[PDB]
Amino acid sequence: TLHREMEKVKLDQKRLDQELDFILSQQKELEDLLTPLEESVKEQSGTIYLQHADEEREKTYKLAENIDAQLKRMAQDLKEVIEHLNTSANPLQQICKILNAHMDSLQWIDQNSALLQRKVEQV
Amino acid sequence: EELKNAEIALRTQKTPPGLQHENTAPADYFHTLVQQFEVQLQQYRQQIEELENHLATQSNTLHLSPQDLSMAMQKLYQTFVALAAQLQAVNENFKMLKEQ
């Protein structure tokens, strides 16, 4: 049985390996695609320049991008905080980890339960 | 997502080269991009308060206690009890419809 599941596991490793390379060829073909957007946006700029005046608000969309970036840094720092909290993780912390697992199970359980109630109401 | 979005932007930038206009899309796009970061901001602040309470305990933390287990046990008992009550409402509604 170990050899059986080993054949399955090697199949899984191979297939996920191939799928990651497919995502990578996507990440590349998409860089190529994002580049034509850049050259054509350059064309649009060199055309809109061939007009009178009056560019639009850029100092606002740039601020939106900056808000996105600051939120990204916040999420990264939250990842760091979670990593350090784990780095801090006696019978005590075992009790805490187990209680957290149990509570998470209760949460997903109530989620499935509400899903059932809503399916019934739609029923 | 990201690939096809770069694709759509490039396609719209291509059609403009001859003569076109595809702009409402990026408008809704910036709209959703802001709506996304919205919840993440509240997340940043909630994590702020979480780290705050954690370190508040950590300055107090030079000791441990045995009662929190019993407290969490009775609370999780009432909790799963409420959860099973909800699941019972769900099974009973399923049965009401499947009897209808």
Binding site: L85, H102, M103 | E50, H54, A72
Partner: peptide, 14 residues
Amino acid sequence: LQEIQQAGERLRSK
């Protein structure tokens, strides 16, 4: 500890 902080908060809430 993040889930555990959340769950302490929740069981306290109930």
